Every structure is written in C-alpha cells, then in structure tokens.
Design a protein around this ligand. Structure first.
Ligand SMILES: Cc1cc2nc3c(=O)[nH]c(=O)nc-3n(C[C@H](O)[C@H](O)[C@H](O)COP(=O)(O)OP(=O)(O)OC[C@H]3O[C@@H](n4cnc5c(N)ncnc54)[C@H](O)[C@@H]3O)c2cc1C
Length: 364
C-alpha cells in the first residue's frame, strides 16, 4: 500500500498534477469528495505552456477552447485601454476554455494512466505521522489505508489539507461588491472581441465568448445594488443598469441577458500563504492563494502551480534531490508569481470607480 503521492482534491489543479505525475510513472492516488459527474474560463500564456507540455493543446480547441489575443476595457462607456497581447510576441495569446471542459479532458487522460488511481466520493478520515513529523499513513473513509511519500492539498479555497493537516488558519477579508457570472446566447459582438466595462458608480460587466455557441457575462455591483438587480428575475433592471455604462457595440450582448435566474456567485478571497508546504505535505491552487476573480486567473494559477509541483515532486521521487529541497524549490518558483497576481487583483478591484487609477493599475 506504499504510493508516491496522495492528492487531496480532483479539481483542475489536482487533476493536472495527477496526470503529469502519472505520465512519469509515479504511483498516485487522488481522493475526491464529489462524484466525478462551473469555474474559471481563462488560460494565460504560462498556463497554455503547461497544457501544451501535457500534449493537450490540440484537444483544447477541438473541444471548444478559443484562442484570443485582444481585450478592450471601457470606463464610463468610453474606451480606456485596448490590449493586443500578440503585437510583439506571437505566443502572447490567451485561451478561453471552461474549467469543467478542461478538467473532463484531463480526467479522460488519467483514465489511461495505469499508475494513477482516482477515488471519487471518498475523503481522508485520519493521518498518522512518524518521528520526523512526516505523514506516513493515511486512512480513507472507505477503510483504505495508504502509505504515501508525499501528500498534496489540491482541495481548493476551503482546503482540508491546509486547515486540518497543516493546522493553518486563514483570516477572511470580504469585499463590498460580489461578482456573479451568467451564461447566455452568443452575440456577434462577443464572438468578435472580449470587452470589459466599468463605471464610476462601481459597476462592472465583462462579456466574452465561451465554448462553441455561448457567451459569459461577468458582473459586479456593490452588494445591495447587486441584490436588487438580481431580484428582478426577468432582467429589466439589469439590462437598464448595463445600458448606463455599456455602449452600442455590445447592444446585442445586453439583449441576450433574458433573465437573472442562472447567474452564479463567484468566490472572492485574498490570500497568498507564507508557506506552500510543511514536512512531506505540499499545496497548490486555491489552497495556497486566492486571487480576485476580476483577474480571471484562478484556474490558470492552479495549472501553473500543478506543473511546478509535478517538476519538483518528480525530482524528489527520482531521488535527484531531497524532498525538502524540491518543495523549497516549488515555493521559490511559484510564490512571487502568485503574489503578483494576488496584488494585481486587489488593486484592480479597489480602483474600478477611479478611471485614471484603474488605467494606472493596468499599465503597472
Ligand atoms: C462559479 C465560479 C466561477 C468562477 N469564476 C472565476 C473567475 O471568473 N475568475 C477567477 O479568477 N476564478 C474564478 N473561479 C475560481 C476558479 O474556478 C478556481 O480558482 C479554480 O478552480 C482553482 O482550482 P483548484 O484546483 O485549486 O481548486 P478547485 O477547482 O476548487 O478544486 C478543488 C477540488 O477539491 C475537492 N475537495 C475539496 N475538499 C475536499 C476534501 N476534503 N476531500 C476531498 N476532496 C475535496 C473539491 O470537490 C474540488 O473538486 C470561479 C469559481 C466558481 C465556483
């Protein structure tokens, strides 16, 4: 019952890590509380590099992923910034791909990896540590006992591994504006170009295509206004509010908002843990950092962490270096990258209303 890595959580980060480790022939058990069976949509160049390394890039666009290289940002109805991400660098492009679509693809690949065992509707019950304080035994709620060299927390914003195995508590810092996302019919303007709108009253509306034939609309307003707008389920108050700061180019996208019933809240946190690991326990993704969803980077960073952790763990598992050195390496690589986006998200979210401050944040 000796295994190389026990991964808690089979979200996008956990799945990507399991697949990358499995491809190397490491013995992996993934534990997921939910049945096999909504999240972020964005892959940035660094995330795309991981996907490309995994041999998955072709399948991504085959399954409705969209390559893009432009963004317009409006403030109070007028164009504030236009970004061409590929103007200097041909590989500057980003990809829009639903988290669930990418995860399903990765799970299909894991299905073919003989050294990976995925356990759904399963959870960690108890752990045992050795005299060196490394976890040496883990019992699952099905009665399964495993002896892993490494335990990984890929278990998201409420990480059991963080809270219970590492006994880390995280202060919460709520924001005054929620963010919500709904899915609608795809208007030609949205198929054309991603457009983000914000206003001096704290409104935000971001329209972008998703999959083959749908569009997302991500919105944010101060809490009580957002409540009012969502309460009018036939959508009239929301369309009217949008019309206040969203210009004609997106008129059809506003018209596509036929109701509010299917809007979903998005989690908003602010975190970058000072330690990404302790003993033989490492964490990735939302377990170690929470970025404001205005950045779009929740999935992307989980994928970037997974790749860096796969590299570090591969080295430790091959005995190319001590686990403690490998994990220290993982933190050194990832922490400044994750930190920069956490800071950026908070700066963006808090500067919305102030046009030049907001523009200032974009430039850096
Ligand atoms: C509706 C919605 C919209 C979102 N949109 C945005 C956005 O616009 N911009 C943005 O930046 N981010 C967004 N996100 C966040 C983004 O989806 C996450 O940051 C991303 O999924 C993080 O990946 P992860 O692998 O670290 O964690 P997760 O994808 O959360 O995966 C964690 C996995 O661990 C499992 N798990 C948890 N606890 C246990 C346990 N005790 N035992 C076993 N398994 C466990 C969970 O079931 C889950 O499968 C959104 C999230 C939601 C819910």
């Amino acid at each position: 019952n000796h295994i190389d890595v026990l991964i808690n959580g089979c979200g996008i980060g956990g799945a990507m890590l399991a697949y990358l480790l499995g491809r190397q022939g490491h013995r992996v058990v993934v534990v997921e509380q939910a049945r096999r069976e909504n999240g972020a949509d964005l892959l940035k160049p660094a995330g795309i590099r991981v996907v490309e390394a995994a041999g998955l890039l072709a399948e991504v666009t085959r399954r409705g992923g969209r390559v893009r290289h432009e963004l317009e940002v409006y403030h109070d109805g007028e164009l504030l910034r236009y970004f061409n991400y590929s103007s200097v660098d041909a590989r500057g492009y980003f990809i829009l791909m639903p988290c669930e679509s990418l995860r399903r693809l990765v799970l299909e690949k894991i299905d073919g990896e003989a050294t990976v065992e995925m356990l759904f509707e399963t959870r960690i019950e108890a752990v045992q540590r050795d005299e060196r304080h490394a976890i040496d035994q883990v019992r699952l709620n099905d009665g399964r006992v495993l002896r892993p060299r490494v335990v990984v927390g890929a278990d998201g914003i409420a990480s059991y591994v963080r809270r219970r195995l590492l006994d880390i508590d995280v202060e919460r810092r709520p924001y005054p504006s929620p963010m919500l996302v709904g899915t609608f019919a795809l208007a030609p303007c949205v198929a054309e170009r991603n457009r983000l709108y914000v206003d001096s009253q704290g409104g935000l509306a971001y329209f972008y295509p998703i999959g083959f034939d749908r569009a997302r609309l991500v919105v944010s307003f101060p809490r009580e206004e957002a409540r009012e707008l969502m309460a009018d389920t036939r959508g009239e108050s929301l369309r009217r509010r949008l019309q206040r700061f969203v210009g004609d180019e997106s008129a059809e996208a506003i018209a596509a908002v036929t109701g509010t019933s299917r809007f979903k809240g998005i989690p908003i946190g602010y975190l970058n843990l000072d330690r990404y690991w302790a003993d033989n326990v490492a964490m990735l993704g939302d377990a170690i950092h929470n970025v404001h969803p205005i950045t779009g980077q929740g999935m992307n960073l989980a994928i970037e962490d997974a790749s860096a952790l796969a590299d570090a763990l591969d080295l430790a598992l091959r005995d190319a270096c001590a686990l403690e050195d490998a994990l220290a390496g993982y933190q050194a690589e990832r922490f400044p990258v994750n930190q920069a986006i956490v800071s950026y998200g908070h700066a963006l979210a808090t500067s919305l209303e102030d046009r030049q401050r907001f523009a200032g944040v974009f430039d850096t």
